[PDB]
Amino acid sequence: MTELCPVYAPFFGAIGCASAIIFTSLGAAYGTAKSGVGICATCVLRPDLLFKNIVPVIMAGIIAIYGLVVSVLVCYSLGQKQALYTGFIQLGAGLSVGLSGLAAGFAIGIVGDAGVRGSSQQPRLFVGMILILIFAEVLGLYGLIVALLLNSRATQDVV
Amino acid sequence: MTELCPVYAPFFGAIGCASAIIFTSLGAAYGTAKSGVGICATCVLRPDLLFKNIVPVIMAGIIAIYGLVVSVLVCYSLGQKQALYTGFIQLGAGLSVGLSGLAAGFAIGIVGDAGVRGSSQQPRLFVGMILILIFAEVLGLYGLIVALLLNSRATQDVVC
Amino acid sequence: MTELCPVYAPFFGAIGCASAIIFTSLGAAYGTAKSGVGICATCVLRPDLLFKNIVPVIMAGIIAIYGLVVSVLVCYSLGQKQALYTGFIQLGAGLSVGLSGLAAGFAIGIVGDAGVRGSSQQPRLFVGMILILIFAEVLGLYGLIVALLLNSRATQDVV
Amino acid sequence: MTELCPVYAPFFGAIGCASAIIFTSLGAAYGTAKSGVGICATCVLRPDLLFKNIVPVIMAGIIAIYGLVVSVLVCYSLGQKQALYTGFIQLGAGLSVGLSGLAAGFAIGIVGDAGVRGSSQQPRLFVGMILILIFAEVLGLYGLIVALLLNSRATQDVV
Amino acid sequence: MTELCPVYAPFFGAIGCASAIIFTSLGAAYGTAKSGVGICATCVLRPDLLFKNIVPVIMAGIIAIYGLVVSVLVCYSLGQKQALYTGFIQLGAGLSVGLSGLAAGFAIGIVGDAGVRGSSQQPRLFVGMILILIFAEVLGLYGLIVALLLNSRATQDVV
Amino acid sequence: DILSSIWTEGLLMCLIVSALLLFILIVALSWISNLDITYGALEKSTNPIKK
Amino acid sequence: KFSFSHFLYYLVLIVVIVYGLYKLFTGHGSDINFGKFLLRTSPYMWANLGIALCVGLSVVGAAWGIFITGSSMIGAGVRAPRITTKNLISIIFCEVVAIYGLIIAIVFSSKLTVATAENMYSKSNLYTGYSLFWAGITVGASNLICGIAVGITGATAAISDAADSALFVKILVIEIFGSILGLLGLIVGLLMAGKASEFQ
Amino acid sequence: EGVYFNIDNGFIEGVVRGYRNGLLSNNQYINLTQCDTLEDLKLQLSSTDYGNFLSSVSSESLTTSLIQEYASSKLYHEFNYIRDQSSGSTRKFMDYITYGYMIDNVALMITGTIHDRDKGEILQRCHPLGWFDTLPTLSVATDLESLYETVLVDTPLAPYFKNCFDTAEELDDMNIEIIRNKLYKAYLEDFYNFVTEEIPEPAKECMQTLLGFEADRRSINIALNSLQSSDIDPDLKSDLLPNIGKLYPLATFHLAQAQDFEGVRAALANVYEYRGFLETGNLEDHFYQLEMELCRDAFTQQFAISTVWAWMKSKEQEVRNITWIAECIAQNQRERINNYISVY
Amino acid sequence: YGIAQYREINAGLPTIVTFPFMFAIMFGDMGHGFLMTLAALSLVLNEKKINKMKRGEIFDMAFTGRYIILLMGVFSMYTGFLYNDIFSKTMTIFKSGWKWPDHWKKGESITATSVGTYPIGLDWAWHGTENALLFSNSYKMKLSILMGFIHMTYSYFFSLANHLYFNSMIDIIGNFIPGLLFMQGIFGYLSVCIVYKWAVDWVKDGKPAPGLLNMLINMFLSPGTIDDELYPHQAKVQVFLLLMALVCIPWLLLVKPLHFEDFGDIMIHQVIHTIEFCLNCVSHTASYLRLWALSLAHAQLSSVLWTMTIQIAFGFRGFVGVFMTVALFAMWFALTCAVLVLMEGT
Amino acid sequence: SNIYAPLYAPFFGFAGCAAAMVLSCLGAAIGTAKSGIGIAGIGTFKPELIMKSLIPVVMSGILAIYGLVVAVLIAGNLSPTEDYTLFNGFMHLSCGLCVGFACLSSGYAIGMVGDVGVRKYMHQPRLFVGIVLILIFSEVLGLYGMIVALILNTRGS
């Protein structure tokens, strides 16, 4: 129906939140499935890596929360009276941030799996690896600006 | 019927109720295969670590019950002429919990299968490796709790 | 005709039972096909485990029983006078039992073969192999309980 | 316009003619791709045999115009005010002839690319080679014959 | 406007000229990719046939310019408003040239690289390599002529 | 003015991209499932002058 | 089969064509016309779909580039740790694309304006949705290509400077080319922003 | 292809290139010229990628066996590490690579019929990569041809086991050689087909070129060995000579039919390639030089899984060159120097 | 290409007279043949000194064919003049009478009719709407069919020409006669019916007519039916023409034993060649239309090049457009000779 | 407005412009990456000839300019609220199509050919006189499309 009163705006909010939350989950899962096993294949014979270079695990886990925060942010605003100008931003806002997280986690996981072996063969190199990791994380962090913009557009104004 | 209360509103309920269970079931089965293969690989050759490594199966059971703890919960929250808005919320909640359980199922089996060998070689590393196991559990609980919040919103806000 | 009792509402049950049984059937078939080679290997190794390795096939039979019971129950839940909501619920219940059954079939075939292939070496294994067997068989229990709950609970109140 | 001479019937002539040309063109190109590379070996091996080797590619060329001739032939039978019956028959003829020529190119090239090797050691082997080869373009000729019949039926029967 | 000349009748005229050019460009790029690598391969060793082996490259660019010339010729024969049947025929004609061009592009390179291999050390292949090339490019104008023929036919029967 | 409202529901502006999301999900699923495990890294033969 | 994926892709396309052609045969070639639905679409469609891609493509491309560059840097680090001081400048190239990709979202949001169901199909807002969608497409694709190209160039530099690391300046002029793409993609979108209106 | 080939394997190529960069280049062979005594070679071999393990355990007198085994130990380590970290397809490709060595190893297994050589001694005499942990095949009677069935049912080499009961079984001294040659041909053909169907096109070519060079070289060398002892049937030669040369499959049949030096000379002249006869006092040295120059083409392609194969071959031939210099110094032969490969 | 046995009629001479003209009719342009014959004349004139100096490896062979080049070129000019095409351009002043009403509106489809025919015909007046193209193309395909059947029938002439020279008329003649009838009774009948168009017109005198080219299936599916009003006794002799070709098969397939002796394996060797010749008939019958196709393609390409160059040059600009036209012709000559003759004729 | 001037005419032109930029820059990126591959291959072994053999790589932004000129020819050519000759937008799409793939073809061909040629150039400098030919020759192939784009665009505009 018209922007004034549709019957599917909350549907779109719900599916957008689902999209974002599932996106962040798998974005984390890819990096985990890479780095955790890659390291476990090393620290077994490289016991000097028990906790000194587990940073990639946390770096990846950082991205697991954006889906949750956007989902809860939209959770307060629900019902069938949300506007359509504020009824379709839900999909784009969620998916942009989610796929940004996917890509950031992919890039993080590759270098995290590389770094454990790089240090095992030469434990003086991760000084650059963590720097590249933090350079990569801001990529996923970027989408949160439009995330909050559209969240304010939607939750604050539903009509 | 009407916009807020169509006859087909409970179609979403009938969908969401069955959604999460199978997602969780398949994620679990994946984890079970991935870990148990290595566990039974090591049992014969190393009959000293065979049964001190069976936390991943329990965590797999946890992710299996993740779906159940919401399945009947939303089933009994559904009616023959529910509000379509409730369907909107519940389908998303069910699919989200299912997919979170799937992600947990993928992570847990691989991490456990790696750690079991990491320990069979160096038992000094057992606690250190199993500590990381809980990351997958936390990841699964993330979607679980957010979707439960949305379920509570659905069961609290009714436009029927 | 009326959505409260259309002729194509029972069309849902016309296929739900078939799907519920078929999923378990194919899962069991794959599991048995896989485990046959492992049981053959262990028996030809030493004909003292053959009588001691029959659990997976019987467990597959029980997996098929899980679909059989729901199919038989819904056989009497069908009728030309049945609501479209009553149609939706039919698949909503019949899908999950079968899907969980096939997942359990796959997992049990995998683990049972991986164990029986090694059964002949250490009988110490046999005390532990039933562990994951039951831990997977409970998957069909989880599916069936909810499937039959929905069946009985929503087959009434046709409206 | 009317079902007899509507606005879409001219589309048949607009397109139906461009079918056989392309099928025969691709068939000839594939035949060349197969056979022509053959000379590259025997020429260096024995430059003596250079003439008898070229027959198959020129047979493919002969086939290559079977489609062009029919395309130009039907090019006049079309128009903005023709009948869709004429379009149907023209399209059928063009497809038949072009695809038959493509099949002939397949068969001729895939045999010539090896006959080039076969005749290398035996300069007089081509006796049976030609006997086999002729059949491909003969089949192309049967492919194109019926196009003339249909076009004759397409140049006097309308509506 | 005219029923026989809808809004998109000029659309078909406009679009039926930007197609053959692309196909010719792709075919020429593929042919030159197949050729030039081998050309410089046989040039690094025996820097003698370099200028000699450039024949097929220029010859393939000749085909490449086919689509450009045909498209530029036909576009002038168009206008702001033209028949839907005229659009039909323009679209039908704007493709065959490029299709035959790709047909050539395949075989020309696939045979030319092998000919270059043979001639890198057997200089007698001067009569050889172009022998198949000439036969390859004759088809390169089969669709070219019909394109302009149908353009001429499009100059009439406009509405 | 809208397309056939019988073959297509009234909400034909909304039930389209849902399949695109699932397509993206499945194509990602394939690639995530494509990864290996490196069994030999932790289980391999040995010899006195060997790994 | 040869491949299930391509098999299904071939099988799917035929049915839609058959349906459309028979629908035309029943006298509906224009009755079911794309332009009809285009008129039946909404500018919010275009706005909300053309904004997520604008930044998503840029971030994904930058992630791919850095994916390449880190795995390249590790290789040269083992043999020569001092490769780092020379090579860090290169990665800056893969990072800088993301900011230029995302900035467009802010100007879009500036153009964004709540529009009612009335005048909801006119160029007042439909034009703006179209334009911002196009600009998002262009910038996203440009940033994808920029990121991948700079990543591969950085990998080349990594594998090269391992031996004779003093060649960095001899090759950075090439990475200049890869850097140009960000500017090329940004300038055209900004020029569009100087011609399009805002939602109304 | 190209970048699409790099979706998750961006590090294997990096580590392979890092290992390859450790190969001795021409500026390292400048010391090989100065290397005229065992002391100089030891001092150099305490400063290179082969450094301080060819001398830490070995004495000043550098013996061939100790030096080569020490050099190849780290190569086995690196290959096993790569195979463990290699993907499934690359894991299978590495398995096929090792299958050549373990065809040679099972050839050693079966060949033992007059000495009943120990399994440990045999695996010491071949690459340990060609030995899983054991082989209960010597339990059965070890005749000239009485274990091919046992090895086939024990080893996974049923494809690579060309039937040795058809023409390789004659209870003859040829057996212990013809079985080896036939199995080598079978494995060469199987690997050729594998690289044809897998190992994408850049890596394809990087395989087939060296595979064909090696197969033709083996053909020529075994033909010489047959001509240097009791001759064989041309059909037997074809069974021995790799039937598919993989660079030229027609002149190999000409060699097989040729049963004289002139016939093989003619079959070699038409190859339009290197001429082993008439210009080689030590044909093996020229073959090794040309093979390494050819595998350098593998490194000429930046996108190919052939990097590991070319690297292992280059390292093995470099160890061969080091041993050759050491021995010619032992014999005080300064002329046999410069036979070392000069491509890298 | 090959050789033949002893005292057999070699086909060396037929090639010299035959091949060049079929090549010539491929393009048939006065300018093209003129230029190439000029090159050949220069070659044969300068060979008094150039025969000794070497050329490019293929350039030497090219030098080796002055007679062949001149022979093809003479026929090229002959056929081009027969077609009145200087790059598909007409210069004919042989007007013989066609309805050209003096009052024409610019755009009106002013048609004509046969009010007088030049005995050679094919004059400039056939340069009009696409009706001209259809007429010309149909006429040319008819001509190709006619010449092809003539050439084939001639080739069959010498088949027995050697056996008489060998007195081998023991079993071969029994093979020559059946195939002779099989080819003639069909294709000669086709040709006579084709020229029947020149025999009688059904519109100059009102009569039913067949299609411009198709009168075929009436013989095959329908027994002894003309159904197209071509000639009366056809209704009776059509069945005869169809029928005397049936016994040829049994006649041919079994003739060896009569000449006792008999083998049983080569006994059946006849059938392969019998079917081979049978299919040869139709295959070569259809073959000849390529000449038509190539002639048409050359005509169209020449015409389009002429248009897009000369008419562009016809643009009015004399101050610096003179340079434009100079460059235009500089390009056009090079194209229309090299890229429009070399590969085509080769 | 009129059915010949609907409410989505600028859609066509702007879609064509977007396609032009994206495709041109895609081709540029692919070509420059391919050239960089050969540059990397040739660097370490002989790190001196790279300066004098920069002929392929400089072609990076040439196709980008090819696309950008066509884009700016009609960039912002339509008012923020205006309907025009729909055929004008049709041809705007058509020329973008004409120009958006010849550039890709040329970029791929030049990148791979030049990569291989420079990789093998290590040994001899004789192929120098010939290498540039194919590169410029693909550049003119791209020129075909770019110029016909303008030719069509000015027509009917």
UniProtKB/Swiss-Prot annotation, chain B:
The chain crosses the membrane at residues 9-31, 54-74, 91-112, 125-150. One of its GO terms (biological process) is proton transmembrane transport. Residues 32-53, 113-124 are cytoplasmic. It is a multi-pass membrane protein. Its main location: membrane. It is found in: Vacuole membrane. Residues 1-8, 75-90, 151-160 are vacuolar. GO terms for molecular function: proton transmembrane transporter activity; proton-transporting ATPase activity, rotational mechanism. InterPro entries: ATPase_proteolipid_c-like_dom, ATPase_proteolipid_csu, ATPase_proteolipid_su_C_euk, F/V-ATP_Csub_sf. Changing E137D: Partial inactivation. Keywords: Hydrogen ion transport, Ion transport, Membrane, Transmembrane, Transmembrane helix, Transport, Vacuole. GO terms for cellular component: fungal-type vacuole membrane; Golgi membrane; membrane; proton-transporting V-type ATPase complex; vacuolar proton-transporting V-type ATPase complex; vacuolar proton-transporting V-type ATPase, V0 domain. Pfam families: ATP-synt_C (PF00137). The keyword Ion transport applies. It comes from the Eukaryota. The record marks E137 as: Essential for proton translocation. Proton-conducting pore forming subunit of the V0 complex of vacuolar(H+)-ATPase (V-ATPase), a multisubunit enzyme composed of a peripheral complex (V1) that hydrolyzes ATP and a membrane integral complex (V0) that translocates protons. V-ATPase is responsible for acidifying and maintaining the pH of intracellular compartments. Belongs to the V-ATPase proteolipid subunit family. Present with 8450 molecules/cell in log phase SD medium. This is V-type proton ATPase subunit c. It comes from Saccharomyces cerevisiae (strain ATCC 204508 / S288c) (Baker's yeast).
Curated annotation (Swiss-Prot), chain F:
It is found in: Vacuole membrane; Endoplasmic reticulum membrane. The chain crosses the membrane at residues 12-32. Residues 33-51 are cytoplasmic. Disruption phenotype: Reduces association of VMA6 with the V-type proton ATPase. Decreases VPH1 protein level. V-ATPase is a heteromultimeric enzyme composed of a peripheral catalytic V1 complex (components A to H) attached to an integral membrane V0 proton pore complex (components: a, c, c', c'', d, e, f and VOA1). Interacts with VMA21. Associates with the assembling V0 complex. Present with 12764 molecules/cell in log phase SD medium. Belongs to the VOA1 family. Accessory component of the V0 complex of vacuolar(H+)-ATPase (V-ATPase), a multisubunit enzyme composed of a peripheral complex (V1) that hydrolyzes ATP and a membrane integral complex (V0) that translocates protons. V-ATPase is responsible for acidifying and maintaining the pH of intracellular compartments. Functions with VMA21 in assembly of the V0 complex. This is V0 assembly protein 1. It comes from Saccharomyces cerevisiae (strain ATCC 204508 / S288c) (Baker's yeast). The chain holds residues 213 to 263 of 265 of the full protein.
Swiss-Prot record, chain H:
This is V-type proton ATPase subunit d. Its main location: membrane. GO terms for cellular component: fungal-type vacuole membrane; Golgi membrane; proton-transporting V-type ATPase complex; vacuolar proton-transporting V-type ATPase complex; vacuolar proton-transporting V-type ATPase, V0 domain. Pfam families: vATP-synt_AC39. It comes from Saccharomyces cerevisiae (strain ATCC 204508 / S288c). Gene3D superfamilies: ATP synthase (C/AC39) subunit, domain 3, V-type ATP synthase subunit C domain. Belongs to the V-ATPase V0D/AC39 subunit family. The gene is VMA6. Present with 1630 molecules/cell in log phase SD medium. It is found in: Vacuole membrane. Subunit of the V0 complex of vacuolar(H+)-ATPase (V-ATPase), a multisubunit enzyme composed of a peripheral complex (V1) that hydrolyzes ATP and a membrane integral complex (V0) that translocates protons. V-ATPase is responsible for acidifying and maintaining the pH of intracellular compartments. This subunit is a non-integral membrane component of the membrane pore domain and is required for proper assembly of the V0 sector. Might be involved in the regulated assembly of V1 subunits onto the membrane sector or alternatively may prevent the passage of protons through V0 pores. It is a peripheral membrane protein. The lineage of its organism: Eukaryota, Fungi, Dikarya, Ascomycota, Saccharomycotina. The keyword Cell membrane does not apply.
From Swiss-Prot, chain I:
Changing K197A: Reduces ATPase activity. One of its GO terms (biological process) is protein localization to vacuolar membrane. Keywords: Acetylation, Coiled coil, Glycoprotein, Hydrogen ion transport, Ion transport, Membrane, Transmembrane, Transmembrane helix, Transport, Vacuole. Disulfide bonds: none annotated. It comes from Saccharomyces cerevisiae (strain ATCC 204508 / S288c) (Baker's yeast). Belongs to the V-ATPase 116 kDa subunit family. The keyword Transmembrane helix applies. It is found in: Vacuole membrane. This is V-type proton ATPase subunit a, vacuolar isoform. One of its GO terms (cellular component) is fungal-type vacuole membrane. Glycosylated. Subunit of the V0 complex of vacuolar(H+)-ATPase (V-ATPase), a multisubunit enzyme composed of a peripheral complex (V1) that hydrolyzes ATP and a membrane integral complex (V0) that translocates protons. V-ATPase is responsible for acidifying and maintaining the pH of intracellular compartments. Is present only in vacuolar V-ATPase complexes; enzymes containing this subunit have a 4-fold higher ratio of proton transport to ATP hydrolysis than complexes containing the Golgi/endosomal isoform and undergo reversible dissociation of V1 and V0 in response to glucose depletion. Present with 55714 molecules/cell in log phase SD medium. The chain crosses the membrane at residues 9-27, 30-46, 61-90, 139-158, 177-197, 241-260, 275-299, 321-346. Its main location: membrane. The gene is VPH1. It comes from the Eukaryota. Residues 47-60, 159-176 are cytoplasmic. Changing H284R: Reduces ATPase activity.
